[PDB]
Amino acid sequence: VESFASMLRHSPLTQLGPAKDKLVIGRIFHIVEDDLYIDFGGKFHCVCKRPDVDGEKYQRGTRVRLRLLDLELTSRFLGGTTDTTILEADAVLLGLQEIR
């Protein structure tokens, strides 16, 4: 049985390295009006806006392309003892993935 240490070393997330300005594939699982909730394989989903072009194409289950920025949006503020987190990830929707 593979060890947890081995699993982590060869994990896709460990291979990604820093997540800033990386390209990843996500999946839309929830849509509220023109807001798309996209799972890109991380801890937290991201929330993007439906593009004007090919808006109807972005339906639930649609795999898309993204440019990650943060896996979790967090920041300590003046007088805080802990980082405030919004339980959300940061990414830029680039467009649909070609099925090919």
């Binding site: 007088g79 805080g80 003892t81 405030t84």
Partner: protein, 117 residues
């Protein structure tokens, strides 16, 4: 970039004399202040002066200043609708930004904690 707060307050770490002496603790509150009311500016002030200017020459006789009197009504008639239309729509929409009440409720969904959980 927020100013530096290192070596400003009077503390047992700081070797030198303090720079900043805050009246109140420097901890972000979970509310925003109530924005103080803003008032507008006089509308049709120029057109009123023109009307009044003509009267002075013509002994306050409306016969001479018939055209100017109609311009004063025109500006007031436009502004009358403008104040009506803008209060009904723009103020209700609050589209551009949040109000103090709406902002504070969002600041309370992710509140600042100066104490350990």
């Amino acid at each position: 970039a927020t100013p530096s707060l290192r070596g400003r307050l009077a503390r047992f770490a700081n070797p030198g004399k303090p720079i900043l002496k805050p009246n109140k603790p420097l901890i972000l509150a979970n509310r925003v202040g109530n924005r103080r009311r803003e008032k507008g500016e006089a509308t049709c002030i120029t057109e009123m002066s023109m009307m009044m200017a003509c009267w002075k020459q013509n002994e306050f006789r409306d016969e001479a200043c018939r055209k100017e009197i109609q311009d004063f009504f025109d500006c007031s008639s436009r502004a009358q609708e403008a104040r009506k239309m803008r209060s009904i729509q723009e103020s209700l929409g609050q589209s551009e930004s949040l109000s103090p009440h709406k902002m504070t409720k969002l600041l309370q969904r992710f509140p600042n904690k100066s104490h350990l959980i």
